[PDB]
RNA sequence: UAGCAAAUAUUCAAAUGAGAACUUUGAAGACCGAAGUGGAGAAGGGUUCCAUGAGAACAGCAAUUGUUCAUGGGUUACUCGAUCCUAAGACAUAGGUUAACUCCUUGCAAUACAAGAAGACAUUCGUUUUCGUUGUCAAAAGGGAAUGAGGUUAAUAUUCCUCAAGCUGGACGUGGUAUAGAGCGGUAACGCAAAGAAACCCGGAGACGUCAGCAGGUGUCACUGGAAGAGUUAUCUUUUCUUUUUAACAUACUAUGGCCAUGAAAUUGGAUUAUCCAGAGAUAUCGGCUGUAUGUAUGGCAGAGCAGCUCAGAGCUGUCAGUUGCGCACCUGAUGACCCUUGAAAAUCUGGGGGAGACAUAAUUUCACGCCAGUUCGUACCCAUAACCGCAUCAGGUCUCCAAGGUUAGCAGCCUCUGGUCCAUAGAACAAUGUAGAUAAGGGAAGUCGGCAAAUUGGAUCCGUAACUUCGGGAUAAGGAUUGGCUCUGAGGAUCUCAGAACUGAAGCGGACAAAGGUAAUCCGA
């Protein structure tokens, strides 16, 4: 499992059978890409990055929420 | 503090074996556990590693020594005399080879 | 009608079989290269180590092979004073220095030597023991004979062309420190064929040994046994010319001279 | 124990099968004297040879 | 107090058989098999025995898994020798050839 | 009839059954007391494992019960082990010996020797090229490519399920490094996803003893505030117990040492508990580089696990923040001491020196991301006061790992928590004799071949301590005192030891446990 700090690489990865898993925690939110040998997590604190990334969900990738 | 009068390192043997035997031994033991001056780096760091084998920790040289000593008197003697005989060999042959010119 | 220990030492399946697992290599000389007969080859002491059965240290010597790219490692006998990383010279022209190897005929009378050769190209025979040296007595004019004086002190005539190491075998003196404990004796003999401990032939019953007498513990038969004594017969001091300790009439060694 | 050869496994299997009781319907045959299987064996009282 | 169980069918305590106690998300204390430590990489010259810098100390296998970096250094003998030995080598070679030529001209 | 008496223990109610001291649930009382009567292995056993059922026999009383009988069912692996490697060793082949059988040699490989391997084109041969003396077996603790947590079965699981990883061998795809010869930065240690190659020669790891102390980490144990639950509540107790967890693996940082600068040290300094280091360059710089995590943070990850509370399978709440230890077990790091001891090897992974060849529409390259595969065998269960060996369900014997609290020098003994267990035929009487356990007024070996047996002594602190001697010793010599409780006082340290004083008891206090009786001679053997 790898995690990503900078949204850019994350977006290069979800731009590269693709599905995206978003999960809510009290203080934080996480976005999760499945790829052959790695599970990519992306965490953010503030709601701005949050909504912005929710926007970022493309038609190619389907969004699952737990 | 002076901890022993006669015995020294021999005290490990405690009361065993008889005096004279561990006299002989006091001698030898103190020989083998002594630090020696290294010919090469000139430190007195040379210690014995194995029976015939001595090392200088700092300069990393290993030399073939005697059993309880670094330097065996009869070996020093053989060096001294090897040299002296070198001198005589060369002086002789080299000198009388001038007689061969006749 | 039992078999003494005396006899049991020649069995090769037996219990007395050397413990060889520690042996590093045989300690011998270089092969007899052309280089050695007509010139000199030089090598390094990569190290001088301890072989578990040996009193004398062994020298590990790098040589460059004359005929190929390979680097040749060899194990020589430590000449006292040899240093790790030393240059060692072997051959005809090699000069006289501690640990170099020349023919004896080139070594000056009165010089001290190691690891001499009985037949030319032994890769060594005489004076290999720790601290041992052989003494150079004389040369024939021809150059083909040399009188050596062996550690035992017997004089021997060796073809002069034979290989010798200048100097004395290393690690001398060990024989002088008394061994106090039995355990020491034990570990020591652990690395060689077992000689230890030694049970006196009298302790044993007549079945285990000619000696063990019986009710008293004596030999009861002359313990000087003749050279031709059969396998199980040969027990005491064999073929002995003298027996006792010479005290008092020691002037005889001198007056008899 | 745990560790076994094939050979072993197979042999053990064999003796395991051979250790069944005479099937209750064999005793009803016309030509048989056999009430029971005389060759049955119990691991505790008798041991096999496998090494 | 939690107690453990070997997981390997080797119950004997051998340098290769070592175990470490790990605490799981389950709340269990589980034996996990710990690997063996290896000796650091030393310069190969005679009597030198220096610890090489900038090379990874890794169990022999993982050496196929690492990046070229850890396998090496940038000197003339990067992997095999330390700087001191390199240096002394350079110097020695140069000066030795110098003496060689000198002997050559003195012969001619 | 002898006899069924070692290993402290059982008791009550219900249920089931023809029948219960001996089965199942519950309620009590005790034991093993983490050197276990606990949790798992190796050897050995081989189905003894699981479920259902049960007449006889067997389970030396009994049985509704079973290690017994009958019937069915259980042992899933790229990452565990075998398989590979080498060892002590051993055996072929070749050669030799024998009437013959047999026997002798062989890794430092031969008492042998016209014995091999590789490459390429060919792709069969053949052709061709290169280098070459010649085998195999022996380790389920040695070496040894990579996996973890959670969940599941009546019985298997690092194997199955779910989720998350790594390894080796394939084969291309897409991006990207490098070159008209073959990365770039730093003075230097060295650095950075990547940066051409054959023969050949050398390396590193693998790869290693025993002991002693120091330092750190993991696990455990202890303590602190918060929250949920539980025990106690006549009295007292802001109480007593419980949960409060984080796998392999990914990225970044720190980590006992070693290096590189700059500068050189005498009124020598530096430094460890100990050693030890320095002009062969110490100490010291807002200096720098590098190596090892069973460390920290984040990812994994909370969605799992754990603890509570609801609803009639769905639901909700919390799982938080600290401190210390010469504590303990293990591991690691830096050392030290020791040897007439000096502590495997090979397979395997990898690096260096060298630059013969190969190649323009080209050639070759230890970067990413994607595609494919991982075969064969062992995986049940016992490992013992009932699954082994002792003709047995025998008080014997049989190789390992994990270990809690209190007292304490202590892994001793004694008592406890987790987990396990009460199984050893039972009832009643209470004579002699016995087996084991204790205590005897006055005397004190008079007993007896003999102080046999018993008794005395015993910890710690303070006193005091001979002859003899190989000067090490003798030595706890001999001997003399003290020891509880309670209330105070002082001293040693960081950003738990030691000593004083006073008071108080049937003058008791190492209160159990634990724990030497001395002395003087003679003989042997050091
Ligand atoms: Mg995967
Ligand atoms: Mg004194
Ligand atoms: Mg044989
Ligand atoms: Mg002597
Ligand atoms: Mg006889
Ligand atoms: Mg008699
Ligand atoms: Mg006598
Ligand atoms: Mg006698
Ligand atoms: Mg078995
Ligand atoms: Mg049996
Ligand atoms: Mg039997
Ligand atoms: Mg009886
Ligand atoms: Mg029991
Ligand atoms: Mg058990
Ligand atoms: Mg069990
Ligand atoms: Mg062998
Ligand atoms: Mg053989
Ligand atoms: Mg492995
Ligand atoms: Mg799996
Ligand atoms: Mg691959
Ligand atoms: Mg060591
Ligand atoms: Mg609390
Ligand atoms: Mg540092
Ligand atoms: Mg939850
Ligand atoms: Mg500690
Ligand atoms: Mg232990
Ligand atoms: Mg060593
Ligand atoms: Mg290169
Ligand atoms: Mg038994
Ligand atoms: Mg009774
Ligand atoms: Mg009395
Ligand atoms: Mg009296
Ligand atoms: Mg009295
Ligand atoms: Mg007595
Ligand atoms: Mg004293
Ligand atoms: Mg006293
Ligand atoms: Mg006395
Ligand atoms: Mg008091
Ligand atoms: Mg006081
Ligand atoms: Mg008082
Ligand atoms: Mg008392
Ligand atoms: Mg007495
Ligand atoms: Mg005695
Ligand atoms: Zn030196
Ligand atoms: Zn070096």
Coordinates of N, CA, C and O in Angstrom, one line a residue, chain E residues 31-88:
Chain E
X31 N 4.3 -15.2 17.2 CA 5.6 -15.4 16.8 C 5.7 -15.0 15.3 O 4.9 -15.4 14.5
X32 N 6.7 -14.2 15.0 CA 7.1 -13.9 13.6 C 8.6 -14.2 13.5 O 9.4 -13.9 14.3
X33 N 8.9 -14.9 12.4 CA 10.3 -15.3 12.2 C 11.2 -14.2 11.8 O 11.0 -13.6 10.7
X34 N 12.2 -13.9 12.6 CA 13.2 -12.8 12.4 C 14.3 -13.4 11.6 O 14.8 -14.5 11.7
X35 N 14.9 -12.5 10.7 CA 16.0 -13.0 9.8 C 17.3 -12.8 10.5 O 17.4 -12.1 11.6
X36 N 18.4 -13.2 9.8 CA 19.7 -13.2 10.4 C 20.4 -11.9 10.0 O 20.3 -11.4 8.9
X37 N 21.2 -11.3 10.9 CA 22.0 -10.2 10.5 C 23.3 -10.6 9.8 O 23.8 -11.7 10.0
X38 N 23.8 -9.8 8.9 CA 25.0 -10.1 8.1 C 26.1 -9.1 8.3 O 25.9 -8.0 8.8
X39 N 27.3 -9.5 8.0 CA 28.5 -8.7 8.3 C 28.7 -7.6 7.2 O 28.5 -7.8 6.0
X40 N 29.1 -6.4 7.7 CA 29.2 -5.2 6.8 C 30.3 -5.5 5.8 O 31.1 -6.4 6.0
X41 N 30.3 -4.7 4.7 CA 31.2 -5.0 3.5 C 32.6 -4.3 3.8 O 32.6 -3.2 4.2
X42 N 33.6 -5.1 3.7 CA 35.0 -4.6 4.0 C 35.8 -4.5 2.7 O 35.6 -5.2 1.8
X43 N 36.7 -3.5 2.8 CA 37.7 -3.4 1.7 C 38.6 -4.7 1.5 O 39.0 -5.2 2.5
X44 N 38.9 -5.0 0.3 CA 39.4 -6.4 0.0 C 40.9 -6.5 0.1 O 41.5 -7.6 -0.2
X45 N 41.6 -5.4 0.4 CA 43.1 -5.5 0.3 C 43.7 -6.2 1.5 O 43.0 -6.5 2.4
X46 N 45.0 -6.5 1.4 CA 45.6 -7.3 2.4 C 45.8 -6.6 3.7 O 46.6 -5.6 3.8
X47 N 45.2 -7.1 4.8 CA 45.5 -6.6 6.1 C 44.7 -5.3 6.4 O 44.6 -4.8 7.5
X48 N 44.1 -4.7 5.3 CA 43.3 -3.5 5.4 C 42.1 -3.6 6.4 O 42.1 -3.0 7.4
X49 N 41.1 -4.4 6.0 CA 39.9 -4.6 6.9 C 39.3 -3.2 7.3 O 39.2 -2.9 8.5
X50 N 38.8 -2.5 6.3 CA 38.1 -1.3 6.6 C 36.6 -1.4 6.2 O 36.3 -2.1 5.2
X51 N 35.7 -0.8 7.0 CA 34.3 -0.9 6.6 C 34.0 0.1 5.5 O 34.3 1.3 5.7
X52 N 33.5 -0.4 4.4 CA 33.2 0.4 3.3 C 32.0 1.3 3.5 O 31.0 0.8 4.1
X53 N 32.0 2.5 3.0 CA 31.0 3.5 3.2 C 30.1 3.5 2.0 O 30.6 3.3 0.9
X54 N 28.8 3.8 2.1 CA 27.9 4.0 1.0 C 27.4 2.8 0.3 O 26.7 2.9 -0.7
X55 N 27.8 1.6 0.8 CA 27.3 0.4 0.3 C 26.3 -0.1 1.4 O 26.6 0.0 2.6
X56 N 25.2 -0.7 0.9 CA 24.2 -1.3 1.9 C 24.7 -2.6 2.5 O 25.3 -3.4 1.8
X57 N 24.4 -2.8 3.8 CA 24.6 -4.0 4.4 C 23.3 -4.7 4.3 O 22.3 -4.3 4.8
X58 N 23.3 -5.8 3.4 CA 22.0 -6.5 3.1 C 22.3 -8.0 3.1 O 23.3 -8.5 2.6
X59 N 21.3 -8.7 3.5 CA 21.3 -10.2 3.3 C 21.5 -10.5 1.8 O 20.8 -9.9 1.0
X60 N 22.3 -11.4 1.5 CA 22.8 -11.7 0.1 C 21.8 -11.7 -0.9 O 22.0 -11.4 -2.1
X61 N 20.6 -12.1 -0.6 CA 19.6 -12.2 -1.5 C 19.1 -10.9 -2.0 O 19.2 -10.5 -3.1
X62 N 18.8 -10.1 -1.0 CA 18.2 -8.8 -1.2 C 19.1 -7.9 -2.1 O 18.6 -6.9 -2.6
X63 N 20.3 -8.4 -2.3 CA 21.2 -7.7 -3.1 C 20.8 -7.7 -4.6 O 21.2 -6.8 -5.3
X64 N 20.0 -8.6 -5.0 CA 19.5 -8.6 -6.3 C 18.3 -7.6 -6.5 O 17.9 -7.2 -7.5
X65 N 17.7 -7.3 -5.3 CA 16.5 -6.4 -5.2 C 16.8 -4.9 -5.1 O 16.0 -4.1 -5.4
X66 N 18.1 -4.6 -4.7 CA 18.3 -3.2 -4.5 C 18.7 -2.4 -5.7 O 18.9 -2.9 -6.8
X67 N 18.8 -1.1 -5.6 CA 19.2 -0.2 -6.7 C 20.7 -0.1 -6.9 O 21.5 -0.3 -5.9
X68 N 21.1 0.1 -8.1 CA 22.5 0.1 -8.4 C 23.3 0.8 -7.4 O 24.4 0.4 -7.0
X69 N 22.8 1.9 -6.9 CA 23.5 2.7 -5.9 C 24.1 1.9 -4.7 O 25.3 1.9 -4.5
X70 N 23.3 1.3 -4.0 CA 23.7 0.5 -2.8 C 24.8 -0.6 -3.2 O 25.7 -0.9 -2.4
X71 N 24.7 -1.1 -4.4 CA 25.6 -2.1 -4.8 C 27.0 -1.5 -5.1 O 28.0 -2.2 -5.1
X72 N 27.1 -0.1 -5.2 CA 28.3 0.5 -5.7 C 28.7 1.9 -5.1 O 27.9 2.6 -4.4
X73 N 29.9 2.3 -5.5 CA 30.4 3.7 -5.3 C 31.1 4.1 -6.6 O 31.3 3.3 -7.5
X74 N 31.4 5.4 -6.7 CA 31.9 6.0 -7.9 C 33.5 6.0 -8.1 O 33.9 6.6 -9.1
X75 N 34.3 5.4 -7.3 CA 35.7 5.4 -7.5 C 36.2 4.4 -8.5 O 35.5 3.7 -9.2
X76 N 37.6 4.3 -8.6 CA 38.2 3.4 -9.5 C 37.9 1.9 -9.1 O 37.6 1.1 -10.0
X77 N 38.1 1.6 -7.8 CA 37.5 0.4 -7.4 C 36.5 0.9 -6.4 O 36.8 1.4 -5.3
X78 N 35.2 1.0 -6.9 CA 34.2 1.5 -6.1 C 33.8 0.6 -5.0 O 33.7 0.9 -3.9
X79 N 33.5 -0.7 -5.5 CA 33.0 -1.7 -4.6 C 34.1 -2.3 -3.8 O 33.9 -2.6 -2.6
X80 N 35.2 -2.6 -4.4 CA 36.2 -3.5 -3.8 C 37.1 -2.8 -2.9 O 37.6 -3.5 -1.9
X81 N 37.5 -1.6 -3.1 CA 38.5 -0.9 -2.2 C 38.0 0.3 -1.5 O 37.0 0.9 -2.0
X82 N 38.7 0.7 -0.4 CA 38.3 2.0 0.2 C 39.2 3.1 -0.4 O 40.0 2.8 -1.2
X83 N 39.0 4.4 0.0 CA 39.7 5.4 -0.7 C 41.2 5.3 -0.4 O 42.0 5.2 -1.3
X84 N 41.6 5.1 0.9 CA 42.9 5.1 1.3 C 43.7 4.1 0.4 O 44.7 4.4 -0.2
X85 N 43.1 2.9 0.2 CA 43.8 1.9 -0.6 C 43.9 2.3 -2.1 O 44.9 2.0 -2.7
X86 N 42.9 2.9 -2.6 CA 42.9 3.4 -3.9 C 44.1 4.4 -4.1 O 45.0 4.1 -4.8
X87 N 44.1 5.4 -3.3 CA 45.1 6.4 -3.3 C 46.5 5.8 -3.3 O 47.2 5.9 -4.2
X88 N 46.8 5.1 -2.2 CA 48.1 4.4 -2.1 C 48.4 3.6 -3.4 O 49.5 3.5 -3.8

